[PDB]
Amino acid sequence: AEAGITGTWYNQLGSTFIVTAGADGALTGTYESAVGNAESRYVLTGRYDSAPATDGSGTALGWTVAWKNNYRNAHSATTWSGQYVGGAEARINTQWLLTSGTTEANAWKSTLVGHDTFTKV
Amino acid sequence: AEAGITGTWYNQLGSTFIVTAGADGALTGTYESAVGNAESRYVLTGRYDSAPATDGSGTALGWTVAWKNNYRNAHSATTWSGQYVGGAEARINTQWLLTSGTTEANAWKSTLVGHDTFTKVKP
Amino acid sequence: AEAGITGTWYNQLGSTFIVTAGADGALTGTYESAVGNAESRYVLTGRYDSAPATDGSGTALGWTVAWKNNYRNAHSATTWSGQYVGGAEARINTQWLLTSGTTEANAWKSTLVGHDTFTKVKP
Amino acid sequence: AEAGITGTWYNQLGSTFIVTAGADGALTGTYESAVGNAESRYVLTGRYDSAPATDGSGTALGWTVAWKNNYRNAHSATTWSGQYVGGAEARINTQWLLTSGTTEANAWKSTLVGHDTFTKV
Ligand SMILES: [Cl-]
Ligand SMILES: [Cl-]
Ligand SMILES: [Cl-]
Ligand SMILES: [Cl-]
Ligand SMILES: [Cl-]
Ligand SMILES: [Cl-]
Numbered sequence: 001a002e003a004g005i006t007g008t009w010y011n012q013l014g015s016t017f018i019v020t021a022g023a024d025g026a027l028t029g030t031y032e033s034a035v036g037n038a039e040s041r042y043v044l045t046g047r048y049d050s051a052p053a054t055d056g057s058g059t060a061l062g063w064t065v066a067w068k069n070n071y072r073n074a075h076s077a078t079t080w081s082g083q084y085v086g087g088a089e090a091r092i093n094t095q096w097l098l099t100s101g102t103t104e105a106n107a108w109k110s111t112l113v114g115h116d117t118f119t120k121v
Numbered sequence: 122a123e124a125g126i127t128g129t130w131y132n133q134l135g136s137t138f139i140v141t142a143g144a145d146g147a148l149t150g151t152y153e154s155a156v157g158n159a160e161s162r163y164v165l166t167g168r169y170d171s172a173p174a175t176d177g178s179g180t181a182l183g184w185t186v187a188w189k190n191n192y193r194n195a196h197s198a199t200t201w202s203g204q205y206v207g208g209a210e211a212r213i214n215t216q217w218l219l220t221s222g223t224t225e226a227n228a229w230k231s232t233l234v235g236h237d238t239f240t241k242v243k244p
Numbered sequence: 245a246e247a248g249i250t251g252t253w254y255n256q257l258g259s260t261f262i263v264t265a266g267a268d269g270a271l272t273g274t275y276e277s278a279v280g281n282a283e284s285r286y287v288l289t290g291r292y293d294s295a296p297a298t299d300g301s302g303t304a305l306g307w308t309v310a311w312k313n314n315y316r317n318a319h320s321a322t323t324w325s326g327q328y329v330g331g332a333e334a335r336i337n338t339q340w341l342l343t344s345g346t347t348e349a350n351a352w353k354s355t356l357v358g359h360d361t362f363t364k365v366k367p
Numbered sequence: 368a369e370a371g372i373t374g375t376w377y378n379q380l381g382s383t384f385i386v387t388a389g390a391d392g393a394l395t396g397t398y399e400s401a402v403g404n405a406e407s408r409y410v411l412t413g414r415y416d417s418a419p420a421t422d423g424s425g426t427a428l429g430w431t432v433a434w435k436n437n438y439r440n441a442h443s444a445t446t447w448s449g450q451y452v453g454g455a456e457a458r459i460n461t462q463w464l465l466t467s468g469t470t471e472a473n474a475w476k477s478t479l480v481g482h483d484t485f486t487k488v
């Protein structure tokens with residue numbers, strides 16, 4: 001729990017997540033996607049339970065990335081919600097929502113949902 | 122635009138969102154929830170598109186709140202993904218995911234999904 | 245109750261849902277969508293709790309529509325999960341998932357999520 | 368595509384799905400869950416694209432199960448939306464929504480979301 005979130009993680013698509021977990025609940029770092037209208041690293045910010053468990057539970061966390069950087073602006077943002085489980089093979093299991101900015105006419109089809117599993121391998 | 126988003130907003134459950142949109146695309150503030158094992162204000166952090174399209178398209182954004190403060194700890198975190206629509210009646214329409222920490226065993230039932238609409242209060 | 249659900253309903257996008265709830269918990273009917281690459285009516289099938297609680301709790305149900313009929317094929321399917329609330333103004337509040345067939349390559353972007361509220365029409 | 372959906376599939380939790388895909392788009396069968404306030408088989412009904420692809424795409428499908436049978440009534444329903452991909456190792460990749468019947472007071476927390484991958488192994 002805690003500390004252990006800090007590091008570089010990769011998900012099944014090959015995207016890389018580099019985070020620092022702060023003693024009080026903050027999550028800061030950068031994200032580089034392997035898919036999308038993404039190009040380079042994007043800033044990410046989130047929050048986690050700094051006091052999880054003590055039944056063998058995971059540590060709830062979440063973070064956001066607005067897909068805009070010095071190279072591209074996809075006019076979308078993705079949020080990942082999930083939990084961290086440490087151990088010999090630590091992982092972060094997440095479900096994400098990706099919203100694109102649309103006109104009201106296309107608001108019904110603005111959000112994609114998926115799931116990503118990140119490991120340090 | 123940072124401004125448009127900066128302000129106090131409320132949603133249909135009676136919760137309060139106080140946010141400041143920074144020039145760099147950052148979102149920081151506090152959230153007061155009307156439901157759940159929540160008590161007092163919680164810190165929120167998010168990101169938004171500081172350069173949206175010039176299209177009556179909404180401005181994409183998202184933020185997270187881990188439900189732990191100095192008074193309560195619910196061992197859960199919520200992320201909201203949506204867009205801000207400005208105008209006379211500005212709104213932030215979102216869909217959210219609430220994940221609870223659980224044992225591997227109950228992980229299948231760790232996440233709730235819903236939707237919230239926030240209305241800005243200002244004269 | 246089967247009845248309560250049986251009828252014609254419309255949602256905020258202007259789509260039409262005609263359903264019959266059978267005694268065994270079955271749902272069958274047709275759906276007319278106001279959006280997407282849809283044209284005409286599509287067949288729908290679902291299930292609902294034919295023995296709900298006796299609690300002003302809603303009646304859980306869900307249904308699917310694959311968007312293929314004799315006129316169009318969008319190579320996608322939508323499932324709606326929600327509950328029916330009866331009363332003077334009966335409503336079915338749902339959250340839906342729309343999955344498109346894609347290549348493994350674009351599977352990450354195969355599913356959309358949203359929410360729909362249906363209002364029953366009847367005098 | 369088509370036909371190939373018919374059979375017995377299992378997901379990572381150990382739940383079993385037995386379906387018959389009908390020439391015109393219907394999906395019928397039974398489901399036995401490994402988790403929840405479930406007990407025995409429950410009836411399931413759905414729809415699939417009977418005419419998918421011709422770029423190597425999967426076959427979109429979805430189905431519902433109301434968790435009520437002769438033994439238990441959990442007052443909930445689950446819908447799975449996803450696509451079938453056949454081949455040497457066929458699978459059905461899905462995301463699901465589980466709604467429980469609640470009073471309006473708890474409507475905000477009525478729906479769970481997850482993902483399941485089913486194989487014939
Ligand atoms: Cl990614
Ligand atoms: Cl992306
Ligand atoms: Cl809230
Ligand atoms: Cl519709
Ligand atoms: Cl299952
Ligand atoms: Cl279940």
Ligand code: NA
Pocket residue numbers: 134136154155156
């Ligand atoms: Na809330």
Ligand code: NA
Pocket residue numbers: 257259277278279
């Ligand atoms: Na629709």
